[PDB]
Amino acid sequence: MDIDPYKEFGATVELLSFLPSDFFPSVRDLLDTASALYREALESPEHCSPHHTALRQAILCWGELMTLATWVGVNLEDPASRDLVVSYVNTNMGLKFRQLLWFHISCLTFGRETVIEYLVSFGVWIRTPPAYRPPNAPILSTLPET
Amino acid sequence: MDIDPYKEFGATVELLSFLPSDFFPSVRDLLDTASALYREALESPEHCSPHHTALRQAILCWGELMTLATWVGVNLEDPASRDLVVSYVNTNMGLKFRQLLWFHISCLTFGRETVIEYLVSFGVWIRTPPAYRPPNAPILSTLPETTVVRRR
Amino acid sequence: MDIDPYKEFGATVELLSFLPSDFFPSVRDLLDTASALYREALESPEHCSPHHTALRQAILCWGELMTLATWVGVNLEDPASRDLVVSYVNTNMGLKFRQLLWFHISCLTFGRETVIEYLVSFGVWIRTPPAYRPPNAPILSTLPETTVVRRR
Amino acid sequence: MDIDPYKEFGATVELLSFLPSDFFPSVRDLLDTASALYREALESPEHCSPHHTALRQAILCWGELMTLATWVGVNLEDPASRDLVVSYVNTNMGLKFRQLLWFHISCLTFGRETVIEYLVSFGVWIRTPPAYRPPNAPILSTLP
Amino acid sequence: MDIDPYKEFGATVELLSFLPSDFFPSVRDLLDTASALYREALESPEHCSPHHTALRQAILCWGELMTLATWVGVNLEDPASRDLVVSYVNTNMGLKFRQLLWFHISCLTFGRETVIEYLVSFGVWIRTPPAYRPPNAPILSTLP
Amino acid sequence: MDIDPYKEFGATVELLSFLPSDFFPSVRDLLDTASALYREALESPEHCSPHHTALRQAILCWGELMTLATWVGVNLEDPASRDLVVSYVNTNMGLKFRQLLWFHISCLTFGRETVIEYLVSFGVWIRTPPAYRPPNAPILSTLPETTVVRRR
């Protein structure tokens, strides 16, 4: 079955690929951000939003993957195999999780539509040659202008 | 951060613990049932209900796990380490996926409250000692077992 | 082309694939039943329903296959080839034809919405492991108590 | 069981017997035409018409027969019987499939009336003796 | 990117594949016809129709390719590669240009419906076996 | 024939010929942008606008040119001829294609009347000699202050 994790929200894996891989923060900062801002709501027994349920599923899966990594670290008897698998897991699933968490945390903080607008603007600016674009990179902010 | 995947639906992992680990069907049967009943909803561009969102997330994760399994299948030379990894992944994640799929599929077809009522009935019947259990264990169905329809 | 024969009727190959091979009667029983109940309607030049058209095509196809079986049985000098061909044809196409005939006859007798529900019930009951399965399957029948008394 | 596939559609085998067996095109051209013009409908979840229903069953049946042709090609070791079976299946059932496909494709494209009057007429042209038969055989066309 | 040039106009490559490659006229006859009938419109400052837009781009592209054919003819010294390049450019891209020009010129002259029914029908005449194919192949005409 | 591709849109080759070669992004950027913003509209079977039709023709033309580049790269035995042909094709047609794609994408994003004014402004500023030219060119941008705050 062909399922896209962003289609229910209107976003596409073709819109997220548009930004460069090095843009997204590390998992440690995104998990800390989530713990700081939304821990209580996530543990709430109500369906606050579809964003909360997606975050809940993604966090539990990452936990299970980390448990698997630790079990491979105790069980697996040779250094090359354990090293190879720890690298593979960390890099590929970390990048995927990083994109998904950044998208949902930004949608909750700034509004999904506003976040998508910011994404498009930033992608467009990274294509424009530097002599012919505004000098400061676009950033999301929540301070008032006054 | 401590999250329970059932708690937003008003069940608990402890309530499901009443079911024995070998109760749940195989992964292939659950995926076949989902393919038969719900493909068009799951693909559709609407958040029809929280159950569809949860199913969507679970399926993608299982898919990525299978991809990793196949990648380990190519990459590692030593058979024993890859065999250990594959057996671990299949057994441990398979059982968890099996439970979550059974729960969300049953809640969609029968109704979440109806599924909770079954769980309770199954638990009550399994506590009874074997010398006194009636042989008709509870099962979820929509029909009288002896349904007769007389057509004109 | 890829086609699902059931999709036009709102069922799927997946949903029917849970029925075991012991469930279907013999081809001789199904042809007897189809004739005894519907010969005149089938021979009518009217589009009575899509079920009638599907039954018509299938019957003629099986007739042609039986003609092929009689031809191979005459022409080939080697009994091993004859036996291999006849056994393959009878077992595989007879089982496929048996499933399709049972589906259309049941839809005509009971009605589709009813057949969908009964099929779903069977699929749910059969996936239950035998240690927990109640001993008697769901039955679909036109005689509820097999005692026939003067109608009203 | 007195089962004529054209009878529910208002023709008969006997009427269709006016066309010689050499007339009908190859199975490949018919399948190509069907794939080009009706692929979407023949795979959609509706009975658009009974012509749509009959075509689906026929296609699936040819599929099963071709699958059997593949099984025979592998599992019999005597080449002579294997060839005899393949040649018989292709020639005899392919002729019937070609007739049925041509009839339903033509009925969908031109309409029953257009096709059937055409049968009755091509027939009239073929009964004419060679010395008076015009070289332009009748042909179906939508151009006014 | 799933880009079929006929799809926005209600045909497909697959339908257009009924015509053999020998059928389409030479590029010179098509360009002569376009110059004789639409030179004024194809050079006026309006989008009279999307057929007018598609034709302009195609003509400019053929122009650039022919300019490249002139540059290759001068700047490569090995004659064998120079000839191979010229022959490849002319044969392969000229076939595609001929198909596209024929389609748009015909759609402008006779109208989409007239052209397309014609495709569906010429196709029907070609699938007929040689022993029964009438010698008069279908042809587009405006005469009543 | 002689044709101006811009004349149907109310611009001319002359007006655009003032833009320098350093102004246009790479072809890889423009194809990425065109896909990311308009793939579904382009694949729609509807005449959304003449801009869509022009973009469609150009994309297919560039695809065919790239096919030619791969063919020449295989078939020719002499690397000098290959390099001369590939470099010519890439530089001249890539620059032409880059200009046309930038024009149509900008017209779709900003709107034509706006693009005309901006082009005229650039042409006026660029013809000024550098000793008197103010140091920063006119900019056309969708983000005025590159600080993005919750919309109204």
E1 part of contact set with chain F, CB < 8 Å: yes
F42 part of contact set with chain E, CB < 8 Å: yes
Please report all neighbours of E, defined by 3+ CB atom pairs within 8 A: D, F
- Best of E121, E125, E133, E142 to disrupt the D interface (most D CBs within 10 Å) is E121
Instruction: Find chain D residues with C-beta within 8 A of E118's C-beta.
Output: 143
Nearest Cα neighbor of A47 from B99, B101, B41, B54 is B54
Q: Which two tokens stand for residue C37?
A: 């109940």
User: Is C126 exposed, middle or buried, given 0-12, 13-18 or 19+ CB atoms closer than 10 A?
Assistant: middle
The amino acid at C124: V
Q: How far apart are CA A73 and CA A82, in angstroms?
A: 6
Instruction: Find chain D residues with C-beta within 8 A of E19's C-beta.
Output: none
D33 part of contact set with chain E, CB < 8 Å: yes
User: Which residues between 106 and 135 in chain E have a beta carbon less than 8 angstroms from any beta carbon of chain D?
Assistant: 117-118, 120-121, 123-125, 127-129, 131-132, 134-135
Beta carbons within 8 Å of C15's beta carbon, 6+ residues apart: B36, C6, C119, C120, C123
Query: Are the C-beta atoms of F125 and F138 separated by less than 8 Å?
Result: yes
Q: How far apart are CA B51 and CA A57, in angstroms?
A: 12
Answer yes or no: do A53 and B58 touch at CB < 8 A.
no
Instruction: Find chain E residues with C-beta within 8 A of D33's C-beta.
Output: 123, 127
Query: Rounded to a whole number, what is the distance in angstroms from the first to the last CA of chain D?
Result: 43
Answer yes or no: do E3 and F56 touch at CB < 8 A.
yes
F151 part of contact set with chain A, CB < 8 Å: yes
Chains D and C touch (3+ CB pairs under 8 A): yes
Beta carbons within 8 Å of C150's beta carbon, 6+ residues apart: none
Query: Are the C-beta atoms of D47 and C8 separated by less than 8 Å?
Result: yes
Instruction: Find chain E residues with C-beta within 8 A of D22's C-beta.
Output: 129, 131-132
Nearest Cα neighbor of B109 from B138, B137, B141, B139 is B141
Distances, alpha carbon A94 to alpha carbons A27, A39, A61, A129, C108, in Å: 7, 21, 12, 31, 56
A84 part of contact set with chain B, CB < 8 Å: yes
Please, after which residues is chain F broken with C–N above 2.5 Å?
none
Query: Are the C-beta atoms of F97 and F34 separated by less than 8 Å?
Result: no
- Best of E127, E136, E139 to disrupt the D interface (most D CBs within 10 Å) is E127
Structure solved via = cryo-EM
Q: How far apart are CA B98 and CA B3, in angstroms?
A: 19
Q: How far apart are CA D33 and CA D43, in angstroms?
A: 15
Answer yes or no: do A14 and F33 touch at CB < 8 A.
no
Query: Are the C-beta atoms of A125 and A137 separated by less than 8 Å?
Result: yes
Query: Are the C-beta atoms of D41 and C75 separated by less than 8 Å?
Result: no
Query: Are the C-beta atoms of B105 and B33 separated by less than 8 Å?
Result: yes
Reading phi first (left if > 0) and then psi (alpha if -120 to 50, else beta), residue A58 is in alpha
Query: Are the C-beta atoms of D136 and E134 separated by less than 8 Å?
Result: yes
User: Is A56 exposed, middle or buried, given 0-12, 13-18 or 19+ CB atoms closer than 10 A?
Assistant: buried
Q: Which two tokens stand for residue A11?
A: 């976003």
Resolution of this deposited model, Å: 2.9
> Which uninterrupted H or E stretch holds F148?
strand F147-148
Answer yes or no: do B81 and A76 touch at CB < 8 A.
yes
User: Which residues between 57 and 76 in chain D have a beta carbon less than 8 angstroms from any beta carbon of chain E?
Assistant: none
Q: How far apart are CA D51 and CA D111, in angstroms?
A: 11
Q: Which residue of B has its CA nearest to C134?
A: B136
Q: Which two tokens stand for residue A115?
A: 């976040």
Nearest Cα neighbor of F42 from F27, F64, F57 is F57
Q: Which two tokens stand for residue A19?
A: 């930004």
Q: Which residue of F has its CA nearest to A127?
A: F29
Answer yes or no: do E128 and D135 touch at CB < 8 A.
no
**Using CB atoms, which residue from C5, C35, C72 is nearest to D57?**
C5
B40 part of contact set with chain C, CB < 8 Å: no
Chains E and A touch (3+ CB pairs under 8 A): no
Chains A and F touch (3+ CB pairs under 8 A): yes
Nearest Cα neighbor of E31 from E70, E66, E7 is E66
Pairs across B and C, CB distance < 8 A: 64
Answer yes or no: do C45 and D72 touch at CB < 8 A.
no
Instruction: Find chain D residues with C-beta within 8 A of E134's C-beta.
Output: 135-137, 139
* Interior angle at CA B127, CA B125 and CA B133, nearest 5: 50
Q: How far apart are CA A76 and CA D35, in angstroms?
A: 54
Query: Are the C-beta atoms of A16 and A6 separated by less than 8 Å?
Result: yes
DSSP letters for A38-69? HHHHHHSSS---HHHHHHHHHHHHHHHHHHHH
Chains E and C touch (3+ CB pairs under 8 A): no
Helix axes D27-38, D94-110, angle to 10 degrees: 30
Query: Are the C-beta atoms of E105 and E112 separated by less than 8 Å?
Result: no
Beta carbons within 8 Å of D93's beta carbon, 6+ residues apart: C64, C68, D62, D65
Chains D and E touch (3+ CB pairs under 8 A): yes
C56 part of contact set with chain D, CB < 8 Å: yes
Residue E130 Cα, gap to closest chain F Cα (Å): 37
Q: How far apart are CA C99 and CA B1, in angstroms?
A: 53
Beta carbons within 8 Å of D128's beta carbon, 6+ residues apart: none
Reading phi first (left if > 0) and then psi (alpha if -120 to 50, else beta), residue C146 is in left
B87 part of contact set with chain A, CB < 8 Å: no
Query: Are the C-beta atoms of C102 and B4 separated by less than 8 Å?
Result: no
- Best of C51, C116, C124 to disrupt the B interface (most B CBs within 10 Å) is C124
Exposure letters F18-55 (e unless 16+ CB within 10 A, then b) = ebeeebbbebebbebbbebbbeeebeeeeeeebbbbbb
Q: Which residue of A has its CA nearest to B64?
A: A93
* Interior angle at CA D88, CA D82 and CA D90, nearest 5: 100
Answer yes or no: do B151 and C111 touch at CB < 8 A.
yes
Answer yes or no: do E56 and F3 touch at CB < 8 A.
yes
Instruction: Count the Cβ atoms, other than its own, within 10 Å of residue A99.
Output: 19
